[PDB]
Design an enzyme around this catalytic site. Structure first.
Site, PDB file in Angstrom:
ATOM      1  CG  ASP A 156     -18.588   0.680  45.715  1.00 57.09           C
ATOM      2  OD1 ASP A 156     -18.189   1.842  45.617  1.00 57.09           O
ATOM      3  OD2 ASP A 156     -19.912   1.033  45.846  1.00 57.09           O
TER       4      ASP A 156
ATOM      5  CB  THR B   5     -22.667   1.497  50.315  1.00 61.33           C
ATOM      6  OG1 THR B   5     -22.330   2.385  51.013  1.00 61.33           O
ATOM      7  CG2 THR B   5     -24.316   1.308  50.335  1.00 61.33           C
TER       8      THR B   5
HETATM    9  F1  ALF Z   1     -19.905   4.681  45.828  1.00 61.71           F
HETATM   10 AL1  ALF Z   1     -20.420   3.227  46.583  1.00 61.71          AL
HETATM   11  F2  ALF Z   1     -20.691   1.878  47.772  1.00 61.71           F
HETATM   12  F3  ALF Z   1     -20.989   2.541  45.290  1.00 61.71           F
HETATM   13  F4  ALF Z   1     -19.704   3.985  48.170  1.00 61.71           F
HETATM   14 MG   LIG Z   2     -22.096   0.894  46.104  1.00 59.70          MG
END
Ligand code: ALF
Ligand SMILES: [Mg+2]
Ligand SMILES: [Ca+2]
Length: 1155
Positions: A489, A491
């Site tokens: 992931d 974020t």
């Molecule tokens: F979908 Al994400 F960090 F949880 F970009």
């Molecule tokens: Mg995320």
């Protein structure tokens, strides 16, 4: 087809059978009295009325057959439908339905039909599968999910929702309540009894229980009862630990909150549970630990929401009403109505009031909306359903174990046939013959294999707790040893959620005193803090924002704006006011916003600044802009000499640089009302100045680069899946060295025509733009020269075409993907033939976490918080972590924010993968020598003493217990371990070692018979007597048992070395030294100690020679077969170009020379 759902493959209607007509009762009722009559009063020994051994065989056989016939209805649903049910003629008499889903989307089941009676004397037939309702439609004579008002063959007119009112009359309310159900999530949360029932039916437990029960013939109750008690204790504690960790990590509790509903012409207060499709709800601000109850469409009002569940980010979104639209079809998929839909699960940050139906305003002054979906059919309902009903539990029951057991059973049957034939040719007693056959059958197939695999897994589970990495399914650790693709992931996993501001630089441009430090090319690297910044930079930073203050004092907006306002120190206040080292007042009147085109934020304000350093006074109109350096360069009138070069150095070294500019409109007085509204965006940008360069630190964990670099050079491939913009995703992926080449983004054109569909190959700089169609192959050259970055919008346009498999191999970065699309990529990678790992923290990647082979859920805790929690618990015996939703669906859970927990799990996977594999091989060898030691050697006069077997048993137990326990190596290696056990290398090595052992034993027996002839008869009941043959065979067997452990042990790149294994090395050395000392006869007392016969001078050299020959031959065969057929290479997707290998070698050499 019966079911019209792509989830369901086939279906069949059934009708239950009574208890006396089952397939495991009626044949028993037929059979049992016949045998009872024969055993009791026939007085003819057709089945040996008087023989105790034969009657016991019949009783055990019939009981085992009945138990297996009963248990076969638990291991399958086809046998359940063939034994306890009959095929119904039609829907008139059917009562049970058997449903089988897609092979990669759940488990088969057999559900019960329910018939309800509506007030119109009609019958509604339904059934629940995976907590999902299915209704019987007689118009097409099939089964369908449900029919809501939002989704229909004709698109509804907007007048249906604009002029909608509350559901009137009690009859309509009751019909909706009994047709759609209640708005809640019914998690079953099973108790201890169901878990124990599920655990006790598994085939390995039944096999162990059957073997232990078979050990009750003549071994006496001492060994069987203790083993059964320990097995029951182990199963009970495993079930208890599983239930405890399931209750600790999985809660899934949603608390309803009161809301206002316009029903029967009046506004009433209703709990959020009692909501039906068609209500007129009034939405207000959503409190903490709550969300929107149902999926609804806004009718009147404006809402600022935080869609942190679908996209995964935290940027607020603006949702408008539908009041300004005429009668038209609902274009909810991509039209103008997508901004009006309000999903269920997000949080409403703010509500702004500013009807056609003449409805009075709600008492709480909210916004009117109409529910469209409810229950388990909402957006988060699918995520909750895939949380718990997506995959089956992984345990020790695999196909490899079954094939291994079948192989050993084939060898056991061969040995048993030989023993039975030789025992019936001599016409011995059938009791001892049958008992010996049963003994060798139970001895060849090992009943200790599952309780050894469980120990080898639980050791790694206990060792993983030092890094605060808990686990739910312990048998997924070996899957971490063969990981080929490791997704990530953005974020929550790599990039830190918080943001910091380093300061503002570049203020020395223009006139320079030749005192500030400069780079090689002349870049100004002077760093000045915001607290020590000038008046102009503070004035620009105090007006170029877009934040809005709520009524309760909270603030919302972009995270970087909040960070720069916190660093500024000024305080925001109502009516758009900025108050207090400048200690001035700023009142912003007009604001400008950017939408990725002409990226710059502009604002005008009235400023009163009372400077304290220079003692000057500034007042009046002011214009502040903040944007990209290129746009400011375009709109600048006096470009400094080092303006172009002073920001390239900052943006190169991992940072975000933004340019600020100011304009003094009127020095004296203010513009006044009705004057700024007529001004356009082009008018205020006529003249501009320069203020400074705001530099923000790159948001990245300190362990991200190191962990990604360790995963890259260890025969693993690292891809990144995120729901953010392609630009930020590409920048972050390039910073952590995921992709190092030219990057091409396959996406819609940036012009955003929004009327026609098109796919283009954009770049980071808008210089390359080609056109691609989804129905043709991608390119024979793009996949070879430049890397790829496929967005989620164009992933659906390539679904089902020929380019789908080409885009799952040459792409490493995915951007802007829906929560459903995050699992399609993993399913495609799994179906291609690779193993996958995924680490995430949000709620959108729940399905991806479930469908991956191994998934890690990184939390946001730290070491200090864990220590505080532990000390608080300790003080209670004499702060908290947000569990979230990712930890529920992930088998693993890391309680620390460090991303280095991702390689560490891999370091603890291979040690579990190697050891288990070794176990199999070693067990096979000891399941082949014993079969030869009970079928050919047993028929001879070879019988060991009572004291000699104890040493061998203790040595074997010590060696097995030492092999089961393993420790991890320091760093990851390039060569991967052996994936499976049924390749040519393992089988060839096992057969070669067995052949060498058999040849050595045959030669020793032949030469010992030649030296000392035997003239008496072979007695199968005689006790132990010292002889040359018994001593020679015992010594050879001891040497062979040492060789089976000291040759098939590899631990150099994946485990600890044999010298560091104190439990095994000392035992091996001691037993080998004792055996060789007794063979060479240097201690005459030792031979007399364990009843050995003195050896001839010529026999001694032969014994030592054959022992050394056996050891050397086994080692040579193992080495050759490992060098010839080793599957130790990397996969095709993890191949590295020579440039990357050269760069890695250069960096390694530089680090080695530095240290
Ligand atoms: F979908 Al994400 F960090 F949880 F970009
Ligand atoms: Mg995320
Ligand atoms: Ca055994």
């Amino acid at each position: 087809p019966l079911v019209d759902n792509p989830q369901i493959k086939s279906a069949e209607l059934l009708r239950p059978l009574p208890l006396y007509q089952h397939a495991y009762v009626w044949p028993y009722v037929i059979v049992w009295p016949v045998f009872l009559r024969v055993y009791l009063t026939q007085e003819l020994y057709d089945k040996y009325i008087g023989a105790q051994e034969w009657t016991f065989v019949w009783i055990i056989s019939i009981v085992t057959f009945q138990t297996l016939t009963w248990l076969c209805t638990h291991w399958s649903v086809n046998l359940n439908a063939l034994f306890t049910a009959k095929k119904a003629s039609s829907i008139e008499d059917a009562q049970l339905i058997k449903v089988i889903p897609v092979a990669n989307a759940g488990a088969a089941d057999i559900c019960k039909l329910v018939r309800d009676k509506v007030g119109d004397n009609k019958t509604n037939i339904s059934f629940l599968f995976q907590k999902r309702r299915f209704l019987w439609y007689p118009e097409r004579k099939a089964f369908s999910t449900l029919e809501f008002d939002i989704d229909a063959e004709p698109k509804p007119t907007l007048s249906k929702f604009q002029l909608s009112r509350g559901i009137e009359s009690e009859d309509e309310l009751k019909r909706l309540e009994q047709h759609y159900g209640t708005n809640t999530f019914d998690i079953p949360v099973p108790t201890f009894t169901e878990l124990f029932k599920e655990h006790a039916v598994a085939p390995f437990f039944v096999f162990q229980v059957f073997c232990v029960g078979l050990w009750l013939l003549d071994e006496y109750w001492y060994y069987s009862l203790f083993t059964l008690v320990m097995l029951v204790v182990f199963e009970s504690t495993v079930v208890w630990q599983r239930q405890r960790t399931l209750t600790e990590f999985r809660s899934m509790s949603i608390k309803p909150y009161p809301i206002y509903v316009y029903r029967l012409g009046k506004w009433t207060e209703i709990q959020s549970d009692k909501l039906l499709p068609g209500d007129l709800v009034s939405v207000t601000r959503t409190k903490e630990d709550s969300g929107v109850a149902c999926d609804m469409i806004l009718v009147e009002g404006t809402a600022i929401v935080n869609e942190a569940m679908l996209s995964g980010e935290s940027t607020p979104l603006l949702k408008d009403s539908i009041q300004l639209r005429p009668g038209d079809a609902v274009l909810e998929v991509d039209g103008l109505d997508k901004n009006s839909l309000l999903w269920g699960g997000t949080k409403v940050l703010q509500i702004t009031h500013g009807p056609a139906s003449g409805i009075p305003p709600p008492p709480d002054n909210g916004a009117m909306a109409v529910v469209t979906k409810t229950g388990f059919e909402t957006s988060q309902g699918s995520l909750v359903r895939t949380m718990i009903y997506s995959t089956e539990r992984v345990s020790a029951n695999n196909t490899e174990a079954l094939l291994f057991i079948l192989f050993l059973l084939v060898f056991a049957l061969a040995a048993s046939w030989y023993v039975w034939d030789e025992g019936v040719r001599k016409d011995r007693k059938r009791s001892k013959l049958l008992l010996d056959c049963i003994l060798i059958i139970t001895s060849v197939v090992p009943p200790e294999l599952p309780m050894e695999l469980s120990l080898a897994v639980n050791t790694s589970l206990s060792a993983l707790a030092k890094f605060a990495i808990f686990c739910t399914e312990p048998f997924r650790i070996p899957f971490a040893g063969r990981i080929d693709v490791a997704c990530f992931d953005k974020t929550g996993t790599l990039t830190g959620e918080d943001l910091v501001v380093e300061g503002i630089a570049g203020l020395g441009l223009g006139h320079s005193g030749t005192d500030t430090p400069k780079e090689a090319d002349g870049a100004h690297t002077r760093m000045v803090s915001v607290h020590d910044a000038g008046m102009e930079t503070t004035l620009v930073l105090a007006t170029a924002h877009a934040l809005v203050k709520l009524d309760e004092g909270e603030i919302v907006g972009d995270p970087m704006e909040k960070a720069t306002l916190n660093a500024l120190g000024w305080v925001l206040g109502k009516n758009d006011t900025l108050t207090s080292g400048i200690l001035g007042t700023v009142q912003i009147k007009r604001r400008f916003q950017f939408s990725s085109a002409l990226k710059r934020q502009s604002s005008v304000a009235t400023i009163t600044a009372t400077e304290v350093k220079t003692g000057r006074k500034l007042r009046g109109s002011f214009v502040g802009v903040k944007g990209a350096p290129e746009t400011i360069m375009k709109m600048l009138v006096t470009v400094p000499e080092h303006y172009e070069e002073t920001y390239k150095y900052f943006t190169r070294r991992g940072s975000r640089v933004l340019a600020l500019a100011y304009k003094q409109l009127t020095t004296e007085g203010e513009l006044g009302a009705n004057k700024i509204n007529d001004l356009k965006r082009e008018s205020v940008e006529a003249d501009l100045h320069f203020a400074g360069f705001l530099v923000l630190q790159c948001p990245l964990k300190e362990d991200a680069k190191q962990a990604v670099r360790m995963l890259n050079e260890s025969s693993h491939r690292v891809v990144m899946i995120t729901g953010d913009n392609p630009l930020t995703a590409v920048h972050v992926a390039k910073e952590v060295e995921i992709v190092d080449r030219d990057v091409l983004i396959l996406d819609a054109p940036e012009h955003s025509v929004y009327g026609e569909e098109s796919l283009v190959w954009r770049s980071v700089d808008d210089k390359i733009r080609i056109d691609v169609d989804p129905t043709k192959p991608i390119d024979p050259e793009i996949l070879k020269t430049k890397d790829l970055c496929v967005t989620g919008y164009a992933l659906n346009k390539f679904k089902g075409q020929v380019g789908w498999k080409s885009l799952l191999r040459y792409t490493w970065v995915y951007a802007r993907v829906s929560p459903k699309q995050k699992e399609d990529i993993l399913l495609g990678l799994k179906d291609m033939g690779y193993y996958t790992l995924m680490a995430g923290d949000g709620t959108n990647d729940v399905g991806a976490l479930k469908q991956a082979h191994v998934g890690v859920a990184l939390l946001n805790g730290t070491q200090e918080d864990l220590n505080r929690i532990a000390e608080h618990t300790r003080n209670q015996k004499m702060p908290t972590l947000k569990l979230g939703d990712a930890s529920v669906a992930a088998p693993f859970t890391s309680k620390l924010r460090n991303v280095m927990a991702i390689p560490n799990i891999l370091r603890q996977g291979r040690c579990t993968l190697v050891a288990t594999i070794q176990m199999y091989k070693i067990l096979a060898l000891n399941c082949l020598i014993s079969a030869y030691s009970l079928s050919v050697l047993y028929l001879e006069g070879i019988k060991f003493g009572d004291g000699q077997i104890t040493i061998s048993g203790m040595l074997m137990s010590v060696c097995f217990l030492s092999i089961s326990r393993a420790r991890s190596v320091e760093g990851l290696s390039k060569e991967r371990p052996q994936p499976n056990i049924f390749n040519f290398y393992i089988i060839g090595s096992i057969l070669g070692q067995f052949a060498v052992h058999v040849a050595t034993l045959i030669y020793i027996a032949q030469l010992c018979d030649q030296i000392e002839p035997r003239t008496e008869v072979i007695d199968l009941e005689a006790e132990f007597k010292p002889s040359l043959l018994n001593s020679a065979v015992y010594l050879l067997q001891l040497i062979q048992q040492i060789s089976t452990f000291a040759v098939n042990y590899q631990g150099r790149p994946f485990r600890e070395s044999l010298s560091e294994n104190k439990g095994m090395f000392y035992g091996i050395v001691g037993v080998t030294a004792i055996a060789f000392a007794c063979s060479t006869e240097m201690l005459p007392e030792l031979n007399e100690a364990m009843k050995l016969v003195p050896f001839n001078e010529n026999f001694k050299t032969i014994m030592t020679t054959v022992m050394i020959i056996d050891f050397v031959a086994c080692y040579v065969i193992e080495w050759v077969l490992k060098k010839l057929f080793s599957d130790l290479r990397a996969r095709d997707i993890a191949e590295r170009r020579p440039d990357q290998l050269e760069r890695e070698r250069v960096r390694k050499e530089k680090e080695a020379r530095e240290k």
